[PDB]
Design an enzyme around this catalytic site. Structure first.
Site, PDB file in Angstrom:
ATOM      1  N   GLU A 220      -9.366  -1.455  -6.554  1.00 38.13           N
ATOM      2  CA  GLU A 220      -9.023  -2.781  -7.023  1.00 38.13           C
ATOM      3  C   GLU A 220      -7.744  -2.782  -7.840  1.00 38.13           C
ATOM      4  OE1 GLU A 220      -9.038  -2.466 -10.527  1.00 38.13           O
ATOM      5  OE2 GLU A 220      -9.526  -0.499  -9.707  1.00 38.13           O
TER       6      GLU A 220
ATOM      7  N   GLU B  75      -7.657   1.415  -8.959  1.00 39.43           N
ATOM      8  CA  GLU B  75      -6.876   1.377  -7.700  1.00 39.43           C
ATOM      9  C   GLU B  75      -7.505   2.137  -6.530  1.00 39.43           C
ATOM     10  OE1 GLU B  75      -2.926   2.788  -8.392  1.00 39.43           O
ATOM     11  OE2 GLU B  75      -2.492   1.417 -10.044  1.00 39.43           O
TER      12      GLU B  75
END
Ligand SMILES: O=P(O)(O)OC[C@H]1O[C@H](n2cnc3ncncc32)[C@H](O)[C@@H]1O
Ligand SMILES: O=P(O)(O)OC[C@H]1O[C@H](n2cnc3ncncc32)[C@H](O)[C@@H]1O
Ligand SMILES: O=C(O)c1cccnc1
Ligand SMILES: O=C(O)c1cccnc1
EC number: 2.4.2.21
Lengths: 347, 347
Positions: free
Chosen positions: A172, A315
């Site tokens: 994310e 991430e």
């Protein structure tokens, strides 16, 4: 429908797992000596999408990007625009997850599910809105919006399976997202906000109290139902968190493994397992996030990460870092010699 | 001489480390967010053999094989011949470390420092004797034999450096070797034998008491000096354990990093650091062995493994599994973009 999707998630193939265990036990080594690497190989063998054997074909890391209205409550130190900037950098391969994914031979898919900025070329467009609602004063989105994104993301995910992808990683990008993540963890685990609210991306310790208060307010005002994962996600979650949950449901429906990342992913996994317990067998932990609420989240998921790197970037960087471990389990399974071949006998 | 060798181990380059830290802090991510991966990159940057920057060229895993006289005390379940058999399999690439090393792109060097069998073709010959003495009734070897092997192995190790090797992994093979390993750990840490004696390669729990007793006897009879690492190794160690210590001294003298493996390697590392504290900065932990005395050993080495796999195979299998992590730190350092380039500012 989402009901069909959830209903069609396959159970693990116990027959393939039994054959796996027997094979692993016969390898050139003391039985059980490779510990969790053996357990991992058997787990993979039970996943229907892998064709009865631990194997890894193509690898993909899906990064769900979105902005949050709760950013206005002063719970994050990075400017809101950093989400859009980093999402663009994802297309240039300069981010942390990009570098680690390349090192593991995996492809990064950047998906925009709700960034508050103009569309970014090169980024997959699935944006629900320009940022979700501020959870401190109301819900992040409507239940309908949550279910729709779940369906869209799960379909995208299982479609990649047709392209040769056998291993997924979740990630994310979204300034302030560790706030709704903490809210969700508090709600699903029944833990007090203070015990699960961390510094996120270097939030100053003097600003933590405010973050805890925001989380409490979000919960009190929205009254999310702990027994309804979709209710929790739509009320105190975010588009990015919903998207991660969708990758998990999608991969599970596809009968394939998914590597969790860090704290944000733990909150999405709690929601996914609440929505459909059948998803659990397909989840694979990667690392142990340095975020405060990590221990509590992992305990409720009954998961013990393989990597202790004190990482807290997000991430999907942790997921990429663990891919070599999944491949190692496969290598062990297929490439080691057997005891019988050397006439060796070990009890 | 060994004195020259120890005297010439270089200290870490603080200048290169400072430049490393500054560079890492400027990467496209919240400062310190990659945790131990950042710490690892800085550590590597300080190693003179790496030319002022975290980098990995060729990789090698050195496996020291030897038999132990203490095997006659019934402390191991595998037949003594299994050492020679597995050493031969190492040349065929069918063992656990071979498969994992291949997966990490590393070459396995099998060295015979004392197997009790006829020489094995394809295996590097550095055998001291056909098995070491039974530590339960006397010393494993003479001090002279210990120093000689240390020197020979350290020279072999630093010579590989000239062949492009920049990262080493240590391993061993030797039925019953977790017994002298436990003795050494007990002596160096001051812990009672019962607290550091494990099941080794599936030793039945009913046979553990005897193993503890053997360890105590070895210590009482030999009276090894905890302040003299060479004294401890020669008295209650083994040829394989000595060889592992030699790889550590060799790599350190060469100014290069060495990946530890499991329990046997922890005992060799305790000895190496006692012999020369300057070796410490070059040691890199891999995984957390499932052997009982692992926690105690690691505590005295002040090391926290990156991998929790409940592994207990030995052979350098854990060291190979961690190589991708070292490469990841290098990738992060060299391939990530910088904050300044995106005009992003994060405190
Ligand atoms: O709740 P918080 O404190 O805002 O932290 C969550 C964010 O930090 C991580 N993150 C990931 N890449 C980033 N690049 C810049 N800044 C942050 C970054 C994560 O992906 C989110 O974007
Ligand atoms: O003290 P213990 O109980 O004998 O355990 C130490 C041995 O087990 C490991 N080991 C590593 N490869 C092996 N292949 C077969 N058997 C054992 C093996 C290790 O390398 C040693 O050979
Ligand atoms: O654990 C994570 O993934 C994490 C922790 C803090 C900030 N961003 C991501
Ligand atoms: O930790 C190890 O390397 C180990 C533990 C038990 C038996 N052999 C090796």
């Amino acid at each position: 429908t989402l009901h069909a999707l959830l209903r069609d998630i396959p159970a693990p193939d116990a027959e393939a797992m039994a054959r796996t265990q027997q094979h692993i036990d016969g390898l050139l080594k003391p039985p059980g000596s490779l510990g969790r690497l053996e357990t991992l190989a058997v787990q993979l063998a039970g996943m229907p999408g892998l064709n009865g054997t631990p194997q890894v074909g193509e690898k993909a890391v899906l990064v769900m990007c979105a902005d949050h209205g709760v950013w206005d409550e002063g719970v994050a130190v990075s400017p809101k625009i950093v989400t859009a900037i980093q999402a663009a950098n994802m297309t240039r391969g300069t981010t942390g997850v990009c570098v680690l994914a390349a090192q593991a031979g995996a492809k990064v898919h950047v998906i925009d599910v709700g960034i508050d900025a103009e569309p970014i070329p090169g980024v997959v467009n699935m944006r629900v809105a320009r940022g979700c609602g501020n959870i401190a004063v109301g819900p992040a989105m409507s239940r309908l919006q949550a279910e729709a994104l779940l369906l869209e993301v799960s379909r995208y995910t299982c479609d990649l399976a047709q392209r040769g992808v056998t291993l997924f990683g979740v990630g994310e990008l979204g300034m302030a997202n560790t706030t709704p993540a903490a809210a969700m963890v508090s709600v699903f685990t029944g833990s007090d906000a203070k015990e699960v609210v961390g510094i996120g991306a270097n939030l100053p310790p003097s600003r933590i109290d405010n973050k805890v208060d925001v989380v409490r307010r979000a919960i009190a005002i929205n009254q999310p139902n702990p027994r309804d994962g979709i209710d929790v996600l739509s009320k105190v979650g975010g588009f990015d968190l919903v998207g991660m949950t969708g990758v998990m449901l999608g991969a599970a429906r596809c009968g394939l493994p998914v590597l969790l990342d860090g704290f944000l992913s733990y909150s999405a996994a709690l929601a996914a397992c609440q929505i459909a317990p059948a998803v659990r067998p397909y989840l694979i932990p990667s690392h142990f996030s340095a975020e405060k609420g990590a221990r509590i989240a992992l305990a409720h998921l009954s998961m013990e990460p393989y990597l202790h790197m004190a990482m807290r970037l997000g991430e999907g960087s942790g997921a990429a870092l663990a891919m070599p471990i999944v491949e190692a389990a496969c290598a062990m399974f297929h490439n080691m010699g057997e005891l019988a071949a050397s006439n060796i006998v070990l009890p």
